């Protein structure tokens, strides 16, 4: 009867900035800056 096309969502609160947007929540993210020792 019906078929839909969509995408993944989850409970993540990881946020990123982009040139156009600020504090965008994403499903997955990678931190590339080392902060600890």
């Amino acid at each position: 009867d019906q078929i839909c096309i969509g995408y993944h969502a989850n409970n993540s609160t990881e946020k990123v900035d982009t040139i156009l947007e600020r504090n965008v929540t994403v499903t997955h993210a990678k931190d590339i800056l080392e902060k600890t020792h």
């Binding site: 839909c4 096309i5 969509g6 995408y7 993944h8 969502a9 989850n10 409970n11 993540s12 990881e14 946020k15 990123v16 900035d17 982009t18 965008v24 929540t25 994403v26 499903t27 997955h28 993210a29 990678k30 931190d31 590339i32 800056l33 080392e34 902060k35 600890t36 020792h37």
Partner: protein, 41 residues
């Protein structure tokens, strides 16, 4: 961490965070125009 580092080290930057998105905007019977299929894992 500190600019005066001895060894084979990452570049030192003045930034606080550098985070790359790898995923989709997390926007949790309807397709993508709504966004949110938490049931599709």
């Amino acid at each position: 961490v500190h600019p005066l580092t001895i060894g084979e080290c990452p570049k030192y930057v003045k930034s606080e965070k550098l985070v790359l998105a790898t995923g989709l905007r997390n926007v949790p019977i309807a397709g993508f125009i709504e966004g949110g299929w938490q049931g599709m894992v």
